[PDB]
């Protein structure tokens, strides 16, 4: 029954990832006064499936100067971690569920760094360290935000936890600036605009590349569900769609930062703000 | 009631104020820090209890601080003094382990920091060897403490496992034949840390 | 625009149907709509006692 | 607006120059220091809480609900002249 | 209980494997596998939070620093006498005597112990850390301060 | 076997350093706050606070003048030694109030209706 | 895992309980509360799926051998990695605080902990170590 | 404390040297002790419980049939 | 090669998972045997002390 | 003669003893670099941490968890300082040593 | 300069640091002073349960 | 050996208000015995009295108001023994079977 | 806090009933074990059935139903 529940979870995750990448193309097109994919299937509804099948019959490039095992292992590790994080969202009852998902998302750094070590490109090694530095820098603000969230999460028996079923079903109006910081931290983790300067998958083709992008979009959906649980009073389909629309909307209208600019932002703005909010919420919670 | 612990709160408040004062003095470009050293010596006197051995250690460290000149070195020596003072009051292997490890980390960092000239790499080499040799002795201490804790169920330092803890203590004094880390340290590290 | 509406509707429908199916499957596995609640040591002790006493009631039923 | 700030300067020599000297106060293209409480709150609501990102977001959301300029080739064609 | 005992015994294999291989990258990969497997072993004992701390600190933070240092400092010299010099037979004999036959075990005269799962309470841990062991908590903070200042002073310029 | 039902909302009343004594003097207040500690402090405590502050000012002026920064060094050193003395004096007053030190002066002043 | 003693089975005798436990369905409301067992199965299933994704283009795709197709087309990270290590340890320390209903002396002890943290952080800020110009 | 100790001399001399671990644990955690019940009370209580069972104001040992 | 290394790792893991429990079982059997010898010697000493101790 | 819990406990203790001696000896025996020596020191710390957590569960006692947190803190601090020193020494001595981080050659 | 000029220049040149320190100070001050003035202020099991039922039955 | 058991956990939670209002003396005796004596043999009569007094009360409720008790206990079972999700069933059961004997 | 206080009160009510039920079951299991031991060791010279090991304090079983491994 656990294997059945996990496969029944896995099916809409992949279907949703295909529909997310189509919806990103089409919403980005509608903001730019065009159409986006319409030809490939009726209303363009077959475009992600033909992208996946095109990459399926695409030639796998295995460079004969790299280490083949780590090269194969990097997108597998990314994909596996995304699927495991989704299972932790929906098929768990653990006491420290948010800490579990934070631990899983801290493991997601390895696919980037294994891709940087494996492929023998000069600037893949240069960009992997930058991407890892960005993700590493914003993980701390995510953790301090979780500290602020957990100060008010108590179940019926009186025990404090990070269990998702014990979270309240009303929006957390008291933590609006922390919610905004959380959303920009999600944007920084997924390497989206305005942090998309670093790429690391420059040597990958066919289904290894497809695994990289499925992992990226599934991680975006994980973080969207986490933000909707923590701040928006629950996990729902409408909230997932609205937050995804917001992320595409921000990608349509903004330019990106330099490397040192978002490093200064994450180490001089977001971390002191989350720590100061934690101290204020701890003072309130007494 | 926490009224019996004002010296601990005073220790922490003094460290918090001293870091901020050292930051403000360095924003002016002061190339000497005798005022910081005097405040460090005052802090050393203010946290030491009224025993003979405690004050012997305190007066010794006040005299030693006159041979050190940077802010970071003074901070490392103060945080090594905290371990040196509180090891004399340790009645378990928990506090024993933490005080010894704080002292080892401070010594390693000071050996790295203060070297100059052609002897810089020799000092860094001897500091690395000391750190590697210290790590396995710390592992031996933790392993046999875990053995003692499982056997007795308490924190009493009795039984056969005290022989390995004694060997840990003999390593920290440079007792032969575990003496060669100190012989390596004497050949390269500068005279003030010696 | 009107071209972006079908994909955005389909994402919602996919997640609605998938969450409904996953809910029905896990409800069949657990038989109570509070299986995902936080449980401390007392609640774990209570569930384990209930399971073992249910097994004992089954064992005693097949003897009369 | 086209105004400048000490801190929003993209380089390092000007960042070092604005935090160690008040030569930027002579330049007329800089935004002046707030003088009272309400001006400080306006400056903080500019820096924190964004509101400059939001104007661009409102424009792009208006474009999301606007008309499109795409032709459906080859069922629809462009426009040419007899001199082509 | 075959898979649980096998998962327990796998940690010793990975501990040997860290030093056995000649590739530093593969040594770090073995260490990451070992720490993940040990975090799952600690959760057999009933510890949920401390296993997550194991994962988050060692795999999430420290192994990234290891991989950056290795990838920045290791030009391939596995042929350059890392294979051509072999290993030490005296050290292997010491490992066999002390860790396989275990002539000086930690249990001493005892040879059998009953493993018992716990029930971790984080309220008890919070009470202990912030009331009963508060001086040790502050001294751990001072050690972290030593680490931060000392690294920033020792950073190569 | 069956454990005790845990009380999540009650924390133990425990200070990390335990005195291991019974008081040998009359107990006025077993748990005085900071206002209680300052309002029953003796004059010798204020005298040693002012002496420490003055010595700190003079020595800070001496050491801060070598880098031409004498006045802020004097102010900081004065505050540093003065807060050390103030913590000492408040602790002494609280120990007299709790009964661990002699408090004949304090019993005849802190109990207006329980004077005699 | 199955219980190996009569005390672990609440002193229920018989052979029906032993077989019923060994062949039980996974249940968070039965014997497997807070179990973390679905995390292992998810890893196994997802590793199977990604391996099938890796292997399949070696069968159903064209391939041509070429020597050019198989060819290539700071200290700030040390700062970030070591600072992230120390700050992650500090957040892990702060987590048992937030999971308790803390009294006031716990609050002031935690604030002393945070104060030491932010004092070291503010020293590194003031010396210009968080300005990533190099 | 839980890992540190401080030793000071009693000015009056009216303090007795004991094990500070035992004293610390007595103040911090206490010490629970029990006694065996006298057997005559056991048979008296068993007789009273048997009488309460027989007279009908006590139920059975199981809720089942 | 990659297939050789994966096969060697799988072989080492399976061989370790089957071979070490026999080492542990032999060690526990030796401890049980020595403990039973100690119990019998203690019973013999108790009988001797009862015989000449009244 | 012995139960499943006794097999589980004895297997845990045998595993951690072999882990401790593997971390102490093996990287030195195989003549590896200072980076791998620091990794093996982390293996030693992991063995001690697992022993403390096992004992804390075994006695129903809090001291093993306190020791676990402390061990993680001290081990990470020492490892970070050691890696910084390794990088500094490598940059100081690579012009004449090549194999500078290997002192067991 | 006074409090006002230095504060305005500091918040104009670096607003996030000043606002972070203000949030931290508000929390510290509320727990130190504001909370202990306005918001701060053996029965058997049967009386406790009777009180719980009495609190439940009106609402 | 004889089979000794008390009702299931949701039934125990559903009947826990009547235990202190109708079997207080057995509860007091069991608490005092467990405070005084650690060996389970030394507290056997009071343990037996408390078990039998709980089971007699369980037999009383099923004779007087079985359907209200069954729906309330099923509600407590469904929602993980959270009392705040079954106030209406609790009110109906306490109306059918009062906690203390009313109008006496 | 009100919900937690109610649940704590109910758990305090239920805890002696459960401990009593545990005690009676433990006694019955001990009786069965003593019958089995008396059947096994009847011919062994000097063996006593039912010999408690400790002298003063009762020893609970090491293992219990409520503590299980997670994975
Ligand atoms: C946080 C990080 C992210 C991870 C979490 C994510 C969640 C999990 C997702 C799963 C991962 C997805 C992708 C998997 C990779 C697929 C394989 C691949 O591409 O090739 C690897 C490939 C092999 O290297 P290579 O490129 O061919 O050679 C380069 C080296 O220089 C060559 O080095 P070398 O030649 O020196 O090494 C040779 C070695 C090569 O090792 C490997 O092949 C890699 C080993 C691990 C890979 C596991 C993947 C599947 C392999 C089969 C597993 C079978 C085990 C049993 C299963 C049951 C089957 C019957 O083979 C051996 O000969 C091993 C010798 C054994 C030890 C000997 C010492 C003791 C002697 C004592 C007596 C002997 C008895 O590179 C890697 O090892 C990449 C590492 C990344 C793997 C994931 C890390 C985590 C693993 C899961 C968690 C651990 C839990 C423990 C459970 C069981 C253990 C696994
Ligand atoms: C390590 C190598 C793989 C070991 C795989 C393994 O142990 O298989 C497991 C786990 O593996 C699987 O069952 C999944 C097989 C993976 C491949 C499936 C592909 C997707 C369809 C067997 O599960 P069961 O005992 O049948 O399930 C127990 C009952 N319960 C459902 C409640 C968990
Ligand atoms: C620029 C620096 C100036 C410093 C001096 C001025 C600042 C004032 C000093 C700070 C406050 C006074 C010192 C502490 C007062 C404790 C006395 C007390 O009882 O106060 C409260 C005690 O609570 C606290 O605030 C306790 C502080 C705990 C501090 C814990 C950490 C101690 C230090 C550990 C360091 C470890 C050692 C490191 C080296 C190994 C509660 O009062 P009450 O009992 O009357 O109220 C009862 C109410 O219900 C709450 O209890
Ligand atoms: C859906 C996705 C939502 C996000 C869409 C927009 C993405 C914007 C990305 C770029 C943001 C830039 C940014 O964060 O700038 C910082 C200011 O804003 C922030 O710091 C913003 C986050 C914090 C919000 C405000 C927090 C304080 C509010 C009041 C708290 C106190 C009262 C209540 C308790 C620092 O830029 P700077 O110029 O200020 O840097 C000072 C030194 N140059
Ligand atoms: C031939 C011999 C082969 C020996 C292999 C030994 C090592 C086993 C590694 C995992 C094998 C997976 C399948 C085995 C079944 C399994 O999960 O066993 C569990 C033991 O835990 C374990 O085996 C724990 C190891 C888990 C390592 C996987 C790491 C995943 C990393 C992903 C990140 C996770 C983030 C944190 C949540 C308990 O099985 P049971 O008895 O309960 O099952 C049946 C009752 N239902
Ligand atoms: C949780 C909340 C976290 C808040 C983080 C605050 C970061 C403080 C770093 C400030 C460093 C910048 C700096 O140079 O500050 C100087 C003093 O600031 C200070 O001394 C401020 C110390 C604040 C301690 C908290 C300004 O004065 P300066 O020394 O540069 O001026 C005379 C020389 N031109
Ligand atoms: C020629 C050699 C001169 C050395 C002077 C020795 C003075 C010893 C004084 C000890 C004393 O009165 O105890 C004070 C005091 C103990 O008496 P209390 O004041 O009642 O605690 O302890 C100290 O302050 C000890 C001072 C130790 C000085 C360093 C050790 C020798 C150098
Ligand atoms: C901002 C800079 C960092 C501030 C925190 C750094 C130190 C961490 C806090 C240590 C607290 C020690 C006990 C405080 C206490 O009992 O205050 C209650 C106490 C209650 O007020 P009362 O009515 O006067 O007793 O508050 C105070 O009077 C002190 C105000 C808090 C000041 C904390 C920092 C002390 C040095 C400056
Ligand atoms: C940077 C800015 C940070 C902002 C921080 C905001 C802090 C907000 C604190 C809000 C406190 C909770 C809201 C009111 C609930 C009180 C509960 C209560 O008394 O229950 C009894 C009672 C309920 O009746 P019952 O049925 O008897 O429980 O409620 C009241 O009496 C509440 C009456 C309204 C009082 C409103 C007070 C507004 C000002 C509070 C302080 C604001 C300044 C603090 C900082 C100053 C500078 C340091
Ligand atoms: C501007 O952003 C974007 C990109 O740049 C970042 C892109 O690169 C792409 C293109 C890349 C894509 C679509 C690859 C990632 C997605 C995949 C592979 C789809 C996953 C879907 C699955 C597994 C379900 C399909 C399989 C089915 C139905 C099974 C069929 C079986 C049978 C018929 C038997 C897009 C669309 C995009 O917008």
Curated annotation (Swiss-Prot), chain A:
InterPro entries: NADH_UbQ_OxRdtase_su1/FPO (IPR001694), NADH_UbQ_OxRdtase_su1_CS (IPR018086). The chain crosses the membrane at residues 2-22, 71-91, 98-118, 132-152, 167-187, 207-227, 229-249, 266-286. The lineage of its organism: Eukaryota, Viridiplantae, Chlorophyta, core chlorophytes, Chlorophyceae. Core subunit of the mitochondrial membrane respiratory chain NADH dehydrogenase (Complex I) that is believed to belong to the minimal assembly required for catalysis. Complex I functions in the transfer of electrons from NADH to the respiratory chain. The immediate electron acceptor for the enzyme is believed to be ubiquinone. The keyword Transmembrane helix applies. This is NADH-ubiquinone oxidoreductase chain 1. Its EC number is 7.1.1.2. GO terms for cellular component: mitochondrial inner membrane. Belongs to the complex I subunit 1 family. GO terms for molecular function: NADH dehydrogenase (ubiquinone) activity. It comes from the Eukaryota. Keywords: Electron transport, Membrane, Mitochondrion, Mitochondrion inner membrane, NAD, Respiratory chain, Translocase, Transmembrane, Transmembrane helix, Transport, Ubiquinone. Pfam families: NADHdh. It is a multi-pass membrane protein. It is found in: Mitochondrion inner membrane. Its main location: mitochondrion. It comes from Chlamydomonas reinhardtii. HAMAP family: NDH1_NuoH. It catalyses: a ubiquinone + NADH + 5 H(+)(in) = a ubiquinol + NAD(+) + 4 H(+)(out). It is an enzyme of class 7 (translocase). The gene is ND1.
Curated annotation (Swiss-Prot), chain B:
It is found in: Mitochondrion inner membrane. Belongs to the complex I subunit 2 family. The chain crosses the membrane at residues 6-26, 38-58, 59-79, 93-113, 128-148, 163-183. It comes from Chlamydomonas reinhardtii. Core subunit of the mitochondrial membrane respiratory chain NADH dehydrogenase (Complex I) that is believed to belong to the minimal assembly required for catalysis. Complex I functions in the transfer of electrons from NADH to the respiratory chain. The immediate electron acceptor for the enzyme is believed to be ubiquinone. This is NADH-ubiquinone oxidoreductase chain 2.
From Swiss-Prot, chain E:
This is NADH-ubiquinone oxidoreductase chain 6. GO terms for cellular component: mitochondrial membrane. It holds the Pfam family Oxidored_q3. GO terms for molecular function: NADH dehydrogenase (ubiquinone) activity. It is a multi-pass membrane protein. Belongs to the complex I subunit 6 family. The keyword rRNA-binding does not apply.
